[PDB]
């Protein structure tokens, strides 16, 4: 059918892998294993259309800053993630993650995702203001532990990629 590519990015230990796995497997990983690079596949129905989403997991750690760019090419939608617990993760968005994505993938739809909303810190408008400052398709909030907001995050991603 329709095959779109999703690449998740963001600071280390911000909830990227857990978000991808609760969406593809309905499973919250317990032991934090820093991701080097990984790939998951999930099917989703949005607006009546069935789309297979390729979830490209990337590294937020600085040791793997030469490998993560290699996952950007031919991306259909970017998931720029931060932690509501971590205010410094939000400021790394316009300092590190927006400059990097807008260089390798300058015209890809971006969705700012505030992970770990069960830990409520970043106020929702602060994240919304960041989305308007970076030029994102939209701003979403979720918590992989509570499994709340996960479906809507990837429904917005499929919407932006289907365009």
């Amino acid at each position, epitope marked *: 059918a329709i095959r779109k590519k999703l690449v998740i990015v963001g600071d280390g230990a911000c909830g990227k892998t857990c978000l991808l796995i609760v969406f593809s497997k309905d499973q919250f990983p317990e032991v934090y294993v820093p991701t*080097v690079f990984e*790939n998951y596949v999930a099917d989703i129905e949005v607006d009546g259309k069935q789309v297979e989403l390729a979830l490209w997991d990337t590294a937020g750690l600085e040791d793997y800053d*030469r*490998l993560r760019p290699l996952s950007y*090419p031919d991306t259909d939608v970017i998931l720029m993630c931060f932690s509501i617990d971590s205010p410094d993760s939000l400021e790394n968005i316009p300092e590190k993650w927006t400059p990097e994505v807008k260089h390798f993938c300058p015209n890809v739809p971006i969705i700012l995702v505030g992970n770990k909303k069960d830990l409520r810190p970043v106020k929702p408008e602060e994240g919304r203001d960041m989305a308007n400052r970076i030029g994102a398709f939209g701003y979403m909030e979720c918590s992989a532990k509570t499994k709340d907001g996960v479906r809507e995050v990837f429904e917005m991603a499929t919407r932006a990629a289907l365009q």
Partner: nanobody
Amino acid sequence: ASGGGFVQPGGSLRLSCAASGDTWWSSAMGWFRQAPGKEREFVSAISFYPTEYTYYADSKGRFTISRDNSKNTVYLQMNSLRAEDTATYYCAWIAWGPWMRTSWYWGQGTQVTVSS
């Protein structure tokens, strides 16, 4: 993915994998493993496009990953194997191509069994 066999605790084993396919090339490639019951684990990986860079997950020097450019083959040398390394070992490629989107490929996998 080839090279899997039955080893004793402390034994060695080298796995092999094609560095790139025919209809595609690889900008990077990694080794993964799946224990019985456990989930998929990242073992090691190398990069091709920027520079030949290696990435491991233990920093203990047990696993060594390399590329023989003559045979177009990546090797994963494993020393001092213990029963905790008993798993199916897969290969992954970041597949590039002239008229294909950059895709993620999974190899077939080879069985590794450490005694006890």
